[model samples]
Target chain A: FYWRAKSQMCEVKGWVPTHRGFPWGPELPGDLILSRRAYVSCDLTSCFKFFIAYGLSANQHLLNTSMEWEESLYKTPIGSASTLSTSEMILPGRSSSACFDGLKWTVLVANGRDRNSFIMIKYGEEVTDTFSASRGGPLRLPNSECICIEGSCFVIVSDGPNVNQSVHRIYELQNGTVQRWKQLNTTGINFEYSTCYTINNLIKCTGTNLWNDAKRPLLRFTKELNYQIVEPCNGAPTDFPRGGLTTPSCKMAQEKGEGGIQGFILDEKPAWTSKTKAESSQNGFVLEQIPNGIESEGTVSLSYELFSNKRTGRSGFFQPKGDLISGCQRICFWLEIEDQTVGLGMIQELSTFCGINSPVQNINWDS
Target chain B: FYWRAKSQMCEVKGWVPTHRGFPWGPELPGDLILSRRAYVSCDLTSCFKFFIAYGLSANQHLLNTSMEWEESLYKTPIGSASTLSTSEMILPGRSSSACFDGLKWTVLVANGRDRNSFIMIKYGEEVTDTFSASRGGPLRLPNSECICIEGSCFVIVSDGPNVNQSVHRIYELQNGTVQRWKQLNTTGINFEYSTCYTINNLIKCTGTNLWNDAKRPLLRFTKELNYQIVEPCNGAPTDFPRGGLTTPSCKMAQEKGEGGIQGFILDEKPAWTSKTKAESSQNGFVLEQIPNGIESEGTVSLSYELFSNKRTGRSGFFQPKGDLISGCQRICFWLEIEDQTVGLGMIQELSTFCGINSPVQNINWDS
Candidate 1:
């Protein structure tokens, strides 16, 4: 049995705190600190060996607001403190002295950077110039590059002038020995601003500032191109599914969160529709799927929610001029869905950058 | 059809003119002068991209005696040469290159040297020297060691203070990339007079130097090991009788071109006897009744000629060993009836070392 994650200080948006009378505003001290100790309950076990923490704002709701910081670490007990004990953060995969203050996390895996997704982790500001090095770790390779993929860690050091022409190495981690592959004569694209997501097991990186050549803008590179694992998976049947198509017809595949999906556009018309039993609560709903076949087929899934005509951040939940779901026999809207899309969609001048889903007719509350 | 080596010179160790054949060392002016223009035919379909070469020698008993070497590039013919050539050495395996100056051949595999076995051909020399840019390779990994096996050609860089304490860098052949390994971090042992065999594949190295600590000798190394491959096995008759073990207990297997057989030997005795029919003229007598085992049982069938009781080299043969007739056995000697019982055993020992068979008895004269 796996250990359960402790109830964290979850900052919910739009919903009230589960604990009655819990204050939302800053109080008690400077810059309201909402701290909670995360203890995983093991089945008859006492402790965990290691863990990596990610830092982000607890309540990441509004686009303009800066995210609050959170961090995770591993601390071997040296004496004991009352209730909430401070943790010592260990390096992502290596057993070295890497410390953390709960505001960031980084690990290397060939899922983030290039056509051959190499392993690397960046923390603090994405634009920050200095990268903190893991103390006591070997930094350079034997030859031009030494990388081995083993047990979820990948390391590649750019060894060239100005980062525009560096050798990219791939390493495989194995017990006792490391396997290295070096690609020296590459065009050398700096994938600094790119983010990664997996689809069908293939790691894909797409973002701006990745092209060494001007003609290749916001280049997307994919490797270990396993498309099976990243296909759109079903979400919990909650009031509003957490994520969906960034744009109708797999355009969602390029929706870079936060930084605005570069060239996203809502479809003028829904391409196609599909009706299937919902995975959760098989008590099905007719999902008007958007037929998209860019890398793979994609569509819009329909669910029930008490959404109003007030548009909520380019989301199809609400559109001005008309309540699309209001006199509807079916959930009508446009969507482009994919499992591992990691960019932002375009939000243009047509009604607050949201889809103007077609008007519908009669509705069936149940069935 | 398989391509034949274009020039016999493609063979690194063929025939060199003996001093007796040409009294004067060289008819040329310079010591290194008489270099011959060599041309090796490859498959006409293969493109001659790059090539490397190595040299070799052998004792009278025909055992390898040199390391692989790397050579400079040979420019390919333009235009028509751009097409893949399948003629003779033209279609060599990837990384295969051949060159011969009327006598030495070398073949190299690119990007295939990373493991210890292949590395010995490159870095068997450096004893206790920190590997750095001076070594012209990658970084020195923690706990990297230097080792070598027998019959490997190597050059020890320097003779220093003490043979065992003198620093040395191991080198094999003409310094090719495919033969590089780690340069050990050491410099205390007298390496020159010391046994050059480090990390040999046999028990000698491990049983002594590897395990012994302070008291171990610098060159505490020994024998080499090589894998034997036998092809085109000849078959045997099922009616072969057993000499020591009974028929049922000494079960055997056989095939046609190359057959398999098994027998149970008890108390240093011949267990099974061959049953292949033989033909002999008046002066030759046929006594063919010896069984052989399959490769899986661990033994190689080789035809070697030795001089007297000396275990030095092989005698020249007119044909490939494969052409030998089935059920052929050469008797080393025939002891006189009076000496047969007394000195027969001693003669057997000497004959065996000289690659000769057991003593034979006089058979009734054939018509």
Candidate 2:
């Protein structure tokens, strides 16, 4: 019942011509059908939501159902494009337009008489609660995001008194009163607007760095905010900017394909380290890192490969390792592309494939 | 089923008397045993081992049977005196005055061509195995003791190359060949002779400190050496110079009895600390230290007493606390005595009680 990622590129002949396409053609038939021994089918409402959010379908009829777009594509509003529509309203009393929670509420910080700031929540047409301020009170609301999900309102406020800690607070809307539920502490590089939110049951936050000393690491938080996993891309390249569907297959020796670099290749027979021979000499994987693959570009990438000493026949059938009966023991290679150069180049190429005719901006290479 | 401590002094009309005694007095039957419950009975073989090793028994014919002394009493042949009869001997060559298992075997260290030391086991008359030495080998053989219990032979060796770590090794005697089973490390201030040995199921070692820094911590180890516990004297007062029979009662108030000193007095009501009021305020015990009970004599002691708020009649029925239907829950107090003065004095007193008429050798304590 889970979606098996089918392809990373579109198959249509001339609609787009990039290694990866933007409007990734169409998800082919029976692709949504059952995988294992079954004849059941899945609903298209979820698929319809995914496509429209990625800016593929132009038909506005898809929005007739109660479907929300993916958070990534709604980066900005759909903006009256062929009938996908949205509405905006104004709150009367708040210092005009600092923040709004999409539904019927707006929150803003107010200056109290004693030279301290207070927080005020405006519900519908009237001001609701004006909370008393403490020493670290009156959060930096102008840079905060107010989210109201299923009647439970929350405000994600970033560094006001402290520069690196963020606070996620839950408030209850009961009989025209905004009551505090709980407050949770969040640690990160910086938690400005649009970076922290609940998406598909996970609280996702993107941290930033001004000097680019390190690539921004993503933090995925549980609902209770107790446990978290950082940069959960698994073995993917840390500097890779996009989340793509990655597949596992038994790799064979072959010539380089037309586009995109062949970042790595396993050389000769892999030898297991003496200490790990008992665990790794059998069917297993080994990870090794390539230093400065782009030559003084200062980016490191890790490559993982599966190995086994037992070989069988000339037909070259992949007898599965371990308990898995279908998929082959496989290999994966990660390549770190500089965000200033290769990442931008790939974006420009994607824009061209989408018929955007975008200008190519070059980063000056001193080395 | 367990030995409830009856008394430190032998129950008799004064052959001799002390908290701890040697040849002190004869056991008086039915002399105040019915406190909490009626007890069954205990074996005399263990008691015989204790009395003989402590010089309480004089008949040398008592050694005719195969019996080992209590480890604590034999603490000085297990250093000599009242024949805690061991049966074994066979030695030849290399100025060898070495002791071995209690029956027909002796082990001694030897020097080879490389000036390296090795070990030899001689059973009855002929040489058995000549073992090669390794890292912590050529053990201090003169300071080691070999004991054989029911066919298994073990050597407790102390401080070979390293001055603080002891090693206990097991050896097999088969067809004139000695084979090693295993070796284990034992740590102590000094592991000379008599400190470490197999007692019942535990391997016990005594640690010492001469600078009066702290009480000598007792270490007990399992046979495999993987588990250990320090300060194994659970209820014995740290200031109590020797381990004696300690009794558990509802510790009521009274004057200093004829023999021992009144350590301290517990106030009528126990005051609870701010944090532990709910637990400590009820029927409980309080421990208070007497600054210098021996004032100018410079000795300190701790006294613990049980208290309760209820008062019924003069017959004095004591109510138990918590889940116990009989005994009151209690906290133990440990007072450290300066080893140089008080410990030696107590030993001298014990020696006198045992009819030693020993010389009074001063320890030259400046304090």
Q: Which candidate has the highest lDDT of all?
A: 2
Candidate 1, residue A160: lDDT: 30
What's every prediction's RMSD, in angstroms? 30.9, 32.5
**Model 2: per-residue lDDT, tens digit, A1-367?**
2112122111111111121211211221110110000000112120001111211111211211111111011111111111122211111111111222333324333322222334444444333344533435334332223333344444433224443344444344422245545444444433222223333334443332221212323444444444342321222222112222232122210121111211111211221000011221222122333342211222224322322222100000000012122232221111111111211111110111111112232211111
Candidate 1 scores an iRMS of 39.5
**Candidate 2 C-alpha lDDT tens digits along B75-189:** 1110011222321222312212122233343444343322265656666477767765564544433222333333344443322454434354434343335544555444333
True contacts kept of 2: 0.00
Count of backbone clashes, every candidate in sequence: 90, 3
Query: What interface RMSD does each of the candidate structures achieve?
Result: 39.5, 45.0
Candidate 1, B1-367: lDDT as tens digits:
2111111111110011000000011010111101011112112221122222222111111123231333222323210111113111222111222321112222322122222111111222221222222332221110101122222323223222222333434433332222333333343322221112121132111001111111112222122222121111223222212122122212222212121111111000121111212211111111222224221222223211111121111011000011111132211111001001121111000000001122212212110
* Per-residue lDDT of candidate 1, residues A1-367 (tens digit): 2111122211111111111111222212111112221111111222122222222112221111111121222332212211112333321211111111122222221111122121222221110011222221222221100111112222233333233434433333222112343332344343222222212222232222122321111222223212221112221111111133333221222221112211111111222212212322212223233334213244343322212221212111111111233342111121111111122221111111121234333233221
lDDT of 2 at A97: 16
How does chain A of candidate 2 score by TM-score against the true chain A? 0.33
Reproduced native contacts, each prediction = 0.00, 0.00
